Tab-separated table of C-alpha atoms (C1' of nucleotides) in Angstrom:
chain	number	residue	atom	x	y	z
A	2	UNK	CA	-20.986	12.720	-15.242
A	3	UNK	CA	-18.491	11.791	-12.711
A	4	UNK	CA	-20.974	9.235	-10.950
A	5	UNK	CA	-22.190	10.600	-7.807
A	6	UNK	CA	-20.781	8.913	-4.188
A	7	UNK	CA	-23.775	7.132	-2.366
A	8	UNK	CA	-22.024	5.409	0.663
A	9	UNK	CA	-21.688	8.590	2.746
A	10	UNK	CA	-25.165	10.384	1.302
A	11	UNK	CA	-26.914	7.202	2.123
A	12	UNK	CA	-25.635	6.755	5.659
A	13	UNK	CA	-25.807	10.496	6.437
A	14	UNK	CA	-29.348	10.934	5.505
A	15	UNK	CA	-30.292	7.917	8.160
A	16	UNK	CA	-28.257	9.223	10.881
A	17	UNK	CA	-29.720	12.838	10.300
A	18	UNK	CA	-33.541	11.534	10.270
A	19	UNK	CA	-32.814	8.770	12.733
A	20	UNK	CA	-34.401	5.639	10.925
A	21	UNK	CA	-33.856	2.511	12.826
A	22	UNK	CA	-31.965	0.301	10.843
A	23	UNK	CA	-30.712	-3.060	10.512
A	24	UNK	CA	-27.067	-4.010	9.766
A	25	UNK	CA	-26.316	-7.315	8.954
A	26	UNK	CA	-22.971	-8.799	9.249
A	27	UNK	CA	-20.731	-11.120	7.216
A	28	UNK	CA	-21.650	-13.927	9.833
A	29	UNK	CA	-25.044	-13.621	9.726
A	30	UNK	CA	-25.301	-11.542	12.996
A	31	UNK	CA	-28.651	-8.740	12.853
A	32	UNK	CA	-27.898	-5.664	14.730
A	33	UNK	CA	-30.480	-3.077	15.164
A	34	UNK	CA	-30.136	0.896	16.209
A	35	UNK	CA	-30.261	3.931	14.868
A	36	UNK	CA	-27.065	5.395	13.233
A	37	UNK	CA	-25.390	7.705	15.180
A	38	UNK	CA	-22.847	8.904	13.423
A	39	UNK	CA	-19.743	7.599	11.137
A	40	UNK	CA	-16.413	7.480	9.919
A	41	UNK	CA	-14.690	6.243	6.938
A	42	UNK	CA	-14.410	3.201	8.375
A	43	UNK	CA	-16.858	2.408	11.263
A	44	UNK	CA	-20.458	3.571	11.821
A	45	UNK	CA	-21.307	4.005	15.543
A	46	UNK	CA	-25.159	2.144	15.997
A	47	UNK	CA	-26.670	3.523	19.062
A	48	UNK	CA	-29.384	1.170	21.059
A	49	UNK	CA	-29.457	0.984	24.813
A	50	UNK	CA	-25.473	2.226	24.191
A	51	UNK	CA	-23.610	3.223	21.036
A	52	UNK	CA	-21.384	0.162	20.057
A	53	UNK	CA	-18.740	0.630	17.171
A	54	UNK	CA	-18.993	-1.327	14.704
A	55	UNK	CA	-16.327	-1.897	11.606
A	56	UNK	CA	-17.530	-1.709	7.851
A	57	UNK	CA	-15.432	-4.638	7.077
A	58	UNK	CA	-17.862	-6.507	9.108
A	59	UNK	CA	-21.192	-5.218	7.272
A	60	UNK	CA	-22.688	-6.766	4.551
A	61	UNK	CA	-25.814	-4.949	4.193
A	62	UNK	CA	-27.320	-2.228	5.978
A	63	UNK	CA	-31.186	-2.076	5.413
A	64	UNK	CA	-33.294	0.888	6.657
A	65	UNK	CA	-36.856	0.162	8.278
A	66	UNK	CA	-38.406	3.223	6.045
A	67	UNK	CA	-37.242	3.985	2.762
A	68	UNK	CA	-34.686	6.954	2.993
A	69	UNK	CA	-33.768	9.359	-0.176
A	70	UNK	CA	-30.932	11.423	-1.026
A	71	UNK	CA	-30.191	13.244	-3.944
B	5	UNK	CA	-13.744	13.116	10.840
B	6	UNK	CA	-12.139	10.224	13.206
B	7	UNK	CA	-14.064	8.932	15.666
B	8	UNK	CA	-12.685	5.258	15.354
B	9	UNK	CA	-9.391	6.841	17.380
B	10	UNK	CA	-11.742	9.214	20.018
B	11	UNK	CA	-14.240	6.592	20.509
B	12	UNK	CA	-11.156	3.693	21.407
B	13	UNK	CA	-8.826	6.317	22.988
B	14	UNK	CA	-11.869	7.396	25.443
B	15	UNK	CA	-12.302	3.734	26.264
B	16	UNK	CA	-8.314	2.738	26.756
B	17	UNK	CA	-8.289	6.058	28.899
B	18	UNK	CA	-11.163	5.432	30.956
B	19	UNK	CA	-10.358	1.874	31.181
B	20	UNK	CA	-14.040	1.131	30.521
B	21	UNK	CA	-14.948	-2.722	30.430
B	22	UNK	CA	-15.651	-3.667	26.649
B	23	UNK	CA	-16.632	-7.139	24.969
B	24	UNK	CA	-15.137	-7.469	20.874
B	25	UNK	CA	-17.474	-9.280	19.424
B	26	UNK	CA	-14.743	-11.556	16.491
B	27	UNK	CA	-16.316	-11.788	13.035
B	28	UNK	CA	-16.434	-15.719	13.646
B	29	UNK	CA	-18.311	-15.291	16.926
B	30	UNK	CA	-16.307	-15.353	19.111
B	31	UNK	CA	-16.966	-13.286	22.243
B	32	UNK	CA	-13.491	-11.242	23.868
B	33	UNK	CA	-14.231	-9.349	27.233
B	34	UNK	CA	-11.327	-6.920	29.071
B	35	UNK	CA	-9.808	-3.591	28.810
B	36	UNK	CA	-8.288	-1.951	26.216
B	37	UNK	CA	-4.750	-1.117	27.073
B	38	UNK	CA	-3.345	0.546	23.659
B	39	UNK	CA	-4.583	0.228	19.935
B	40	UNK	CA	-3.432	1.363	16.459
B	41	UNK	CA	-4.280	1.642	13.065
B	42	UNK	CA	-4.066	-2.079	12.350
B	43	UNK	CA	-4.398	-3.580	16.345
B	44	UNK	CA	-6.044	-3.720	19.600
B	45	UNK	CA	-3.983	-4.988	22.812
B	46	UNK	CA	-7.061	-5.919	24.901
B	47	UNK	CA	-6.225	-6.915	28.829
B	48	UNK	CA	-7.892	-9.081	30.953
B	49	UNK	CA	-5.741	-11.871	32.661
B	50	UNK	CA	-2.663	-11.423	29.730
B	51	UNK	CA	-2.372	-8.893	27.157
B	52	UNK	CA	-3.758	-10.533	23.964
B	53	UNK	CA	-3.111	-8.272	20.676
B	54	UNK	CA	-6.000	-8.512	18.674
B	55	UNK	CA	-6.671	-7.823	14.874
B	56	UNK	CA	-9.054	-5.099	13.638
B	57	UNK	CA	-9.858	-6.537	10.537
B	58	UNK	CA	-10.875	-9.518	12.798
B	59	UNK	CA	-13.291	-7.574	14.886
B	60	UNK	CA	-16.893	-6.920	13.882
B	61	UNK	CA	-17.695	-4.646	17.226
B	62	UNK	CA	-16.123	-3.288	19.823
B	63	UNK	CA	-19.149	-3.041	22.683
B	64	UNK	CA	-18.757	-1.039	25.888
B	65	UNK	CA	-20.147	-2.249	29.271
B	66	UNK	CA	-20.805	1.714	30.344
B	67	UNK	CA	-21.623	4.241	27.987
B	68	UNK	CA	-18.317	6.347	27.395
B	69	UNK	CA	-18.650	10.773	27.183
B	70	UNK	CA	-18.992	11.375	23.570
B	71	UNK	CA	-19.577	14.852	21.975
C	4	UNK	CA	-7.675	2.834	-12.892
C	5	UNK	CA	-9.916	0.993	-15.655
C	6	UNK	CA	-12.835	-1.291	-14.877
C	7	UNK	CA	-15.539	-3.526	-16.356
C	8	UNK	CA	-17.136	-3.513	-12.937
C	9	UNK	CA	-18.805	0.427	-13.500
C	10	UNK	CA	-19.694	-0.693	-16.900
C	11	UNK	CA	-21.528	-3.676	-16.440
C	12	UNK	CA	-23.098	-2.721	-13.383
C	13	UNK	CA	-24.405	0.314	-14.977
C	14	UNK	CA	-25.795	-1.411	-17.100
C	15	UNK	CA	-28.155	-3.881	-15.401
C	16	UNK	CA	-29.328	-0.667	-13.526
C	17	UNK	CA	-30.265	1.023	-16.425
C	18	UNK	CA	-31.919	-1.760	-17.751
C	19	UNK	CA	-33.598	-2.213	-14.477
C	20	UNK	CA	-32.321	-6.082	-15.187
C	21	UNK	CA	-33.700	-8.720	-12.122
C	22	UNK	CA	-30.422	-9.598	-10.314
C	23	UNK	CA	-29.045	-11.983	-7.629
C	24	UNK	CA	-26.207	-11.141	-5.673
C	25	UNK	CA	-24.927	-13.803	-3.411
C	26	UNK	CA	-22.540	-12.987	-0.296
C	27	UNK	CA	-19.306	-14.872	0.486
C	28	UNK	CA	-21.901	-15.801	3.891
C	29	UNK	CA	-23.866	-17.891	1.210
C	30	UNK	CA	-26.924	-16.059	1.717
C	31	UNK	CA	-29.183	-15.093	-1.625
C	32	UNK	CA	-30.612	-11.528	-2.243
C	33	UNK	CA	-32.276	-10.478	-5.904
C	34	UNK	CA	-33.756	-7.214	-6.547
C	35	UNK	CA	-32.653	-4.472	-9.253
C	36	UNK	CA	-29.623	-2.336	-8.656
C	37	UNK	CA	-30.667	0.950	-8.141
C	38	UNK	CA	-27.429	2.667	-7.663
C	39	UNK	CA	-23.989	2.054	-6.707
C	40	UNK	CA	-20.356	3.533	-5.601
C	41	UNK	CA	-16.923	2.446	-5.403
C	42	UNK	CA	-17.362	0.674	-2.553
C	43	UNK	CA	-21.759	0.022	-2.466
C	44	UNK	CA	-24.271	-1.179	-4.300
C	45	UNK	CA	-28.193	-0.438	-3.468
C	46	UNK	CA	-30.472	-3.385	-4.105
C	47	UNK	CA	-33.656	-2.533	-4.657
C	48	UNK	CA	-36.711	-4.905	-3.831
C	49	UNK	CA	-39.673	-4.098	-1.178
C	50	UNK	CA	-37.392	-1.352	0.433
C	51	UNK	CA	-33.360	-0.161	-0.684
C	52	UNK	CA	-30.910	-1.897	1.336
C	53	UNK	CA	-27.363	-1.029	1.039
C	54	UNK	CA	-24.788	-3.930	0.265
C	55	UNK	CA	-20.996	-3.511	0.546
C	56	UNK	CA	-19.625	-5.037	-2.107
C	57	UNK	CA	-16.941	-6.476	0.362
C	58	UNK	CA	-19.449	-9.089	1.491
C	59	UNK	CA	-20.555	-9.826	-2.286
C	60	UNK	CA	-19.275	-12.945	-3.802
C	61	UNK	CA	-21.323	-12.982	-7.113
C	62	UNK	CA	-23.419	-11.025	-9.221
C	63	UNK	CA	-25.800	-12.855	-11.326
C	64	UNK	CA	-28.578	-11.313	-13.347
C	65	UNK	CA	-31.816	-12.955	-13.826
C	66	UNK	CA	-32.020	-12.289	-17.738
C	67	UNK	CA	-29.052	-12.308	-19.925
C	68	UNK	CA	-27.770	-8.666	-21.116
C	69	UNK	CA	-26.196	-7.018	-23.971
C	70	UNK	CA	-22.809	-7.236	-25.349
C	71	UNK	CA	-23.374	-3.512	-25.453
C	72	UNK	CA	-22.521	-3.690	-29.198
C	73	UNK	CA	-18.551	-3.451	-28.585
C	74	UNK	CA	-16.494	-3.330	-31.912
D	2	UNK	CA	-0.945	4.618	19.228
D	3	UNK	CA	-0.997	6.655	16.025
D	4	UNK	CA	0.236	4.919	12.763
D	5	UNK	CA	1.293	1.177	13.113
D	6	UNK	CA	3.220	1.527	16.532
D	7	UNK	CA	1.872	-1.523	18.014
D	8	UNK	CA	2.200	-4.018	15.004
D	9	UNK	CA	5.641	-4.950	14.759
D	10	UNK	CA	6.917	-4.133	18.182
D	11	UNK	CA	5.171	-6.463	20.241
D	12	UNK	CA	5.733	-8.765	17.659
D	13	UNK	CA	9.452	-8.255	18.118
D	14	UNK	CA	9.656	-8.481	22.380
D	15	UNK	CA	8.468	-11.988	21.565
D	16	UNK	CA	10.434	-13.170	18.738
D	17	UNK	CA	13.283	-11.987	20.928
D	18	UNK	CA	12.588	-13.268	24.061
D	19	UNK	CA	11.499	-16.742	22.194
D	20	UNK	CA	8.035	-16.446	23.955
D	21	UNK	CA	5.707	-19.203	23.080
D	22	UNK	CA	2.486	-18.022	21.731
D	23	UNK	CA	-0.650	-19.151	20.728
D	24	UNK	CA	-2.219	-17.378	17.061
D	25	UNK	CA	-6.067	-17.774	17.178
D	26	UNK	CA	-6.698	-18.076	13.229
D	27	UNK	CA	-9.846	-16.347	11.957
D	28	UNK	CA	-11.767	-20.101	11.186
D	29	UNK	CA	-10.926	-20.882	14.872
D	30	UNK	CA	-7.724	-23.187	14.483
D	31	UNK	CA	-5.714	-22.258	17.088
D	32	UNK	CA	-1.660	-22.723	16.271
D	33	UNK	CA	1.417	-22.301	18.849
D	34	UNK	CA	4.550	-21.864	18.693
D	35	UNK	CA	7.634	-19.326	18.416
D	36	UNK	CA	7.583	-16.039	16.600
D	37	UNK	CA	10.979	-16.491	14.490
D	38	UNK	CA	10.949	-13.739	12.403
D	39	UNK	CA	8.126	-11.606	10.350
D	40	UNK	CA	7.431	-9.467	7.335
D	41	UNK	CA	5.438	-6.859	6.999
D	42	UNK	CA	2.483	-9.166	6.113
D	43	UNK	CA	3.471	-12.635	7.168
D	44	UNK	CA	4.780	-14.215	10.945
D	45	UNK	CA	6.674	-16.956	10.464
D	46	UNK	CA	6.126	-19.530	13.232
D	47	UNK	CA	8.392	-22.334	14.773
D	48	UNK	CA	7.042	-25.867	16.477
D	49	UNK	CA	8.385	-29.278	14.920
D	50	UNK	CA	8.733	-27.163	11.396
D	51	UNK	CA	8.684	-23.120	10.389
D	52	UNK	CA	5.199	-22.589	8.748
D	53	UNK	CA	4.366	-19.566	7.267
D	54	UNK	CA	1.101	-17.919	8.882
D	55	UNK	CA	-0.811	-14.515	6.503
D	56	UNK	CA	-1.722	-11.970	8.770
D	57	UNK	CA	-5.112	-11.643	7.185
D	58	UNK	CA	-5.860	-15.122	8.550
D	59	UNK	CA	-5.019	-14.266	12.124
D	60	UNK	CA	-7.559	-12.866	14.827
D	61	UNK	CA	-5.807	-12.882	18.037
D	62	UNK	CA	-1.878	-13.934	19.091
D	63	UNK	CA	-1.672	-14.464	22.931
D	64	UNK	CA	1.554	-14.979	24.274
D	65	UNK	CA	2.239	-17.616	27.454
D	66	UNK	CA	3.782	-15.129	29.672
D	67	UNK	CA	3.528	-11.371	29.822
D	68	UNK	CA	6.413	-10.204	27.959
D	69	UNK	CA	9.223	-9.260	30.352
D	70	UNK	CA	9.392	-6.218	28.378
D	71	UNK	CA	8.831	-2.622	29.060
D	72	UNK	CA	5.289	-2.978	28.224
E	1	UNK	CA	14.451	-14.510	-18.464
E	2	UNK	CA	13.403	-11.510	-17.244
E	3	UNK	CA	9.922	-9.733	-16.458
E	4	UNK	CA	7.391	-7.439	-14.736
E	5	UNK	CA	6.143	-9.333	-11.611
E	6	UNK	CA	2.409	-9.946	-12.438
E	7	UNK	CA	1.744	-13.558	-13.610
E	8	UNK	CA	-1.894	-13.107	-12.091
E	9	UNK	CA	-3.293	-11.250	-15.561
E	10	UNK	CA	-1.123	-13.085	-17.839
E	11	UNK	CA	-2.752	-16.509	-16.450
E	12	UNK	CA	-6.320	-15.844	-16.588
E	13	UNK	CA	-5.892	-13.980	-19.796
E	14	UNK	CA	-4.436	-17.231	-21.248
E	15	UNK	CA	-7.546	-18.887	-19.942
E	16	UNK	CA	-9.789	-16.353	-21.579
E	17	UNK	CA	-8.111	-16.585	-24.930
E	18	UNK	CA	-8.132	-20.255	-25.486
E	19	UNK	CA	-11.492	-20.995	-23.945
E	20	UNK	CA	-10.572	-22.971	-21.186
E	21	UNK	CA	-13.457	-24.133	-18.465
E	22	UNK	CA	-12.785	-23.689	-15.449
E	23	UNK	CA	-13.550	-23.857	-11.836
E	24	UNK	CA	-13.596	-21.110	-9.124
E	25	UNK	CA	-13.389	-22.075	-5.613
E	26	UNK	CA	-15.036	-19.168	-3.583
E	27	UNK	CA	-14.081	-18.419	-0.062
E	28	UNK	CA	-16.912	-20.105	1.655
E	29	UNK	CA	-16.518	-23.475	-0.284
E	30	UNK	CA	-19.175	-22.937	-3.568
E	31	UNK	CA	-17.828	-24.231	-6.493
E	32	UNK	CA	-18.161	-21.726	-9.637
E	33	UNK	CA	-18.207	-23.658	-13.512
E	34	UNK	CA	-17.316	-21.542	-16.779
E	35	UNK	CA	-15.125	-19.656	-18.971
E	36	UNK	CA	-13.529	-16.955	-18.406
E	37	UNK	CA	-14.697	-13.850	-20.548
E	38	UNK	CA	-13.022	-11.039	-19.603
E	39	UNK	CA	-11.819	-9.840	-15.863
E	40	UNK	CA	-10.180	-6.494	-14.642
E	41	UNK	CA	-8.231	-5.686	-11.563
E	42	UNK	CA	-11.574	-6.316	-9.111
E	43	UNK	CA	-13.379	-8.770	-11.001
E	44	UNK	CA	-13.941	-12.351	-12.815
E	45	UNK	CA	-16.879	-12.331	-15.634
E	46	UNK	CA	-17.598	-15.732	-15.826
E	47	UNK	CA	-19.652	-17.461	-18.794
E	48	UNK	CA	-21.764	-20.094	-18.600
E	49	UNK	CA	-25.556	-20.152	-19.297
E	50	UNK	CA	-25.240	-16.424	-17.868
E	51	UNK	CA	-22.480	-14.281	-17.519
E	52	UNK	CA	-22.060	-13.666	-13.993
E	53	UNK	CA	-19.203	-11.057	-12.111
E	54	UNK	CA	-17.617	-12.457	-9.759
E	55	UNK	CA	-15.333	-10.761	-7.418
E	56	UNK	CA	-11.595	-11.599	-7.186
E	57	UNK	CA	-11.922	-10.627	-3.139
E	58	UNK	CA	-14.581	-13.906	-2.609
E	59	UNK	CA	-11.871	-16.450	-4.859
E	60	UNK	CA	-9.656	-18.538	-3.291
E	61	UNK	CA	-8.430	-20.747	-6.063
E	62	UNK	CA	-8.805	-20.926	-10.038
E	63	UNK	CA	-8.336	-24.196	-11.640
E	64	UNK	CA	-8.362	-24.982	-14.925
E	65	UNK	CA	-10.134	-27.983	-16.288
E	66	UNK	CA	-6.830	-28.377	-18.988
E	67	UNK	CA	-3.380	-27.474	-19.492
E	68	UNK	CA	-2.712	-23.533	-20.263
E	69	UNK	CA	1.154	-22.730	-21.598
E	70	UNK	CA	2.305	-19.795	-19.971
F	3	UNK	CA	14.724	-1.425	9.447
F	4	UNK	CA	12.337	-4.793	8.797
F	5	UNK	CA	12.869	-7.192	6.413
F	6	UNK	CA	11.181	-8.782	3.779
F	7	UNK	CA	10.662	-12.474	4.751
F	8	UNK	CA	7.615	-13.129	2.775
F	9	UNK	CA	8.927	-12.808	-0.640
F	10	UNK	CA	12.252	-14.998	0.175
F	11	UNK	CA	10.563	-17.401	1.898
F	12	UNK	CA	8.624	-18.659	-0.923
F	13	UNK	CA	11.256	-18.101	-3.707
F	14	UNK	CA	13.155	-19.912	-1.662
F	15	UNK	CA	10.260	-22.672	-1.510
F	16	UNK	CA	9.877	-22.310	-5.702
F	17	UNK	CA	13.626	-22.394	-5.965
F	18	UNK	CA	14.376	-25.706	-4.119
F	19	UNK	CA	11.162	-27.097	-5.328
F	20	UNK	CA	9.894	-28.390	-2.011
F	21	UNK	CA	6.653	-30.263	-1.373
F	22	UNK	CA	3.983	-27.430	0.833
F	23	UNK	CA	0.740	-27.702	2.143
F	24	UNK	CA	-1.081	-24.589	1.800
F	25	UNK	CA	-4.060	-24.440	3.978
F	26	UNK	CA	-6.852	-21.828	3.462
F	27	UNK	CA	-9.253	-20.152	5.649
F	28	UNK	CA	-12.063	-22.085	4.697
F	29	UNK	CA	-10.404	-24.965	6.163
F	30	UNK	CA	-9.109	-26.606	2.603
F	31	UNK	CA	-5.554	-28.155	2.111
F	32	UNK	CA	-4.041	-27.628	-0.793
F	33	UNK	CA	-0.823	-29.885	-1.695
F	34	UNK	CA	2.393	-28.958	-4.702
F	35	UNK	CA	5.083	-27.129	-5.370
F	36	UNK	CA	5.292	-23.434	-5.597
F	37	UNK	CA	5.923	-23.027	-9.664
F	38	UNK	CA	5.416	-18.731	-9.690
F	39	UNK	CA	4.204	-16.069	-7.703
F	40	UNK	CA	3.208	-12.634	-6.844
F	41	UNK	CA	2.308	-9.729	-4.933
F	42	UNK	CA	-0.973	-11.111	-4.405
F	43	UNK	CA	-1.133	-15.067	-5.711
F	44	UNK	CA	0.754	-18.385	-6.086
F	45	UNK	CA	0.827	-20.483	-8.872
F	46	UNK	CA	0.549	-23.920	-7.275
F	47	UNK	CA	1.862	-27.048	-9.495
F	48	UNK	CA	0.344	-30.716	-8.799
F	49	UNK	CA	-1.397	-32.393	-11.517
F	50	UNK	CA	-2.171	-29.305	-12.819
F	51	UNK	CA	-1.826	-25.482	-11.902
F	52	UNK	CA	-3.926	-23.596	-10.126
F	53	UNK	CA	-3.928	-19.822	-8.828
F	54	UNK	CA	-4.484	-19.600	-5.440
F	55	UNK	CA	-5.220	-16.111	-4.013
F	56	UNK	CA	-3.263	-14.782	-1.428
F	57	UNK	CA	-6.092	-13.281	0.006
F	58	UNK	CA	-7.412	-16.853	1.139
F	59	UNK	CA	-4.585	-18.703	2.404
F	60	UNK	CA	-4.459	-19.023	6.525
F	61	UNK	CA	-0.163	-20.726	6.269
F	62	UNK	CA	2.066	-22.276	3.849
F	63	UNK	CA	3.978	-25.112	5.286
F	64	UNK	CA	6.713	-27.000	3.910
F	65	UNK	CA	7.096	-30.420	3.873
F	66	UNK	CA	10.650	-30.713	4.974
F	67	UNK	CA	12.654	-27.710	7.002
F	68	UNK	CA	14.219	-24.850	5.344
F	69	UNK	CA	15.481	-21.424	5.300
F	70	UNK	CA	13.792	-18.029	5.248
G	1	A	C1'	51.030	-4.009	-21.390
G	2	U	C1'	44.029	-3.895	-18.374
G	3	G	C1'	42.940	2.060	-17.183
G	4	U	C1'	43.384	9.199	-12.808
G	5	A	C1'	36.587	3.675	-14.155
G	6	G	C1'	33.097	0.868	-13.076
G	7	A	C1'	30.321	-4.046	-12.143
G	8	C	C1'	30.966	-8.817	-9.837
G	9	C	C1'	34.594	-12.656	-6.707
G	10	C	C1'	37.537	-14.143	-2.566
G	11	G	C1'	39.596	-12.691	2.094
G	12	U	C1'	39.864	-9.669	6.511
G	13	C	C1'	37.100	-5.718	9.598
G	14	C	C1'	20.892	-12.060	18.172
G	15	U	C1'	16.810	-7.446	11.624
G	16	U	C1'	11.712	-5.245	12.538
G	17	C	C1'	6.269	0.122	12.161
G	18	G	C1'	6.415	3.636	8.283
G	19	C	C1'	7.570	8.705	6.410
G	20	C	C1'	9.795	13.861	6.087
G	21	U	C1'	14.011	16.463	7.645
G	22	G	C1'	19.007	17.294	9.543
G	23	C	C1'	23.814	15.173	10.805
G	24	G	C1'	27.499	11.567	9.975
G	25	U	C1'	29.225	6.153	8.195
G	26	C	C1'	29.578	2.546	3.714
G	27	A	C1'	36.982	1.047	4.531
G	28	C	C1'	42.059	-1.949	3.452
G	29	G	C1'	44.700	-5.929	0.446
G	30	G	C1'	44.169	-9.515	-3.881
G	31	G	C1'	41.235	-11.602	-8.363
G	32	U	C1'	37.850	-12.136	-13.036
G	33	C	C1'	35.027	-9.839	-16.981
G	34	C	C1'	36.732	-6.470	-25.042
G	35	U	C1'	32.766	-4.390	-19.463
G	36	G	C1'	23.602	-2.222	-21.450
G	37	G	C1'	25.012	1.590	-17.441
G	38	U	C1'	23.946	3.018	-12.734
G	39	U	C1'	22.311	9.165	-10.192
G	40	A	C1'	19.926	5.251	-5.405
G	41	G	C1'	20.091	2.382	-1.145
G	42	A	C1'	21.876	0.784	3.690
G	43	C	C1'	23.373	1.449	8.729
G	44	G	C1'	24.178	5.527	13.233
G	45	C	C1'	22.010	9.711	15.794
G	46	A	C1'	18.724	13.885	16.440
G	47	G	C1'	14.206	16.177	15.578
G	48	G	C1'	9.173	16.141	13.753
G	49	C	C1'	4.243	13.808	11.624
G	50	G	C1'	1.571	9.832	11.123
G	51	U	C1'	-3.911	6.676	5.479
G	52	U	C1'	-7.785	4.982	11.854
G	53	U	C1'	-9.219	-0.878	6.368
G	54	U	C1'	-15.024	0.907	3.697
G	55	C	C1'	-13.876	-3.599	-4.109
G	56	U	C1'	-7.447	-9.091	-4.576
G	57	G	C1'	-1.245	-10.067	0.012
RNA sequence: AUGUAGACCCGUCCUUCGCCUGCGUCACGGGUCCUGGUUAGACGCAGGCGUUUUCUG
């Protein structure tokens, strides 16, 4: 089968059970939030205020409880 | 679903104070005065146009009205 | 529109092969690919993490894999 | 504002006007000069010599004055 | 003469035919040893004790150890 | 309507055969003469060549002054 | 002898975001070539819309 998208599953599913989550960028920066919501491009990360953040800054984006989609 | 262009327009518009945080560190502080697609023109003392694929996040000093 | 990246990702998941994926920051992670995307891979090790494959530099598995038999 | 409006424009009031300007690269190095002339992906930059400066490498460019442009 | 523009795939597939070790400079300075086994539009696979995939976004330069005839 | 400066900038480089410096994000300077090139690499000619990615080159300068 | 043709040559008449559309402009003298060869592009003006960089410029 067509191999199924998991970027936007993945993200959507933390946003909608809002799991705090660590993103870490390409310069070794930890942020730390809960994912408010996102676009195909940034993913606004919502602390004490939402911040924007680009995806061409992430390199990984690790959940503090494991999240499933399907 | 955009929210890169309503979350920068409602910024520009309010003239909310933001820091850019650059993805070498670097720490940018002012206003942002207009922005496209591929730029920023951020405004503090001088209007300094400044690359998005450069930026890792755009932080606001107040929260801004979102949905 | 063709790729060995889809193929030989595939698979090391399948295979549930040990990996090590470094990022152009230098830093190290290993676990077993679990899924992946055009533009994502999840790493799978204590918890899944999600790694853009933007920030990957390398992707080295721990045992050596299959030719896949190719004629 | 929508599309690239503010990419080559700007870029233009200076390279016109012959304002000096300073290009913050993305590793820090800071280069000045004059704009005097650029592609789509490249600005060409005049001190001593014309070097040619990638886009992709730049973070910032920060002109000396405030162009006297319509602005 | 005359030609198509690429001389990217030509190059490295030159490299892969005859064997030739090389050395991949990455983007943040590590040095990469091997041969080249087979690459695609996105990616390097790169033989040495393993085969690793490297990605053509995280290489700066390729060098090769010998002289390839293009 | 634009231009396209990038393209006969270095053919003109290539064509003349001029020493460049080609310096790359990561801080490295590269030194030769511009043999081929591409949408997205340059085939750089000292003792040996080497393909250098576009994608991690910060400025090509020439040794000695020339046209676009 | 060389064209009710064309492609080049010579001479005369302070580039810049893309794209769709509509309107116009790309001329005049002379020269070479037993001539893979193209159906498009460029500039002017009007109007409209705009991939938000998530795997090589």
């Amino acid at each position: 089968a067509k191999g199924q998208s998991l970027q936007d599953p993945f993200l959507n599913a933390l946003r909608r059970e809002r799991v705090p989550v660590s993103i870490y960028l390409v310069n070794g920066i930890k942020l730390q939030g809960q994912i408010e919501s996102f676009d195909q491009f940034v993913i606004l990360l919502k602390n004490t205020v939402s911040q924007m953040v680009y995806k061409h800054a992430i390199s990984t984006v690790v959940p503090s409880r494991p999240v499933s989609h399907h």
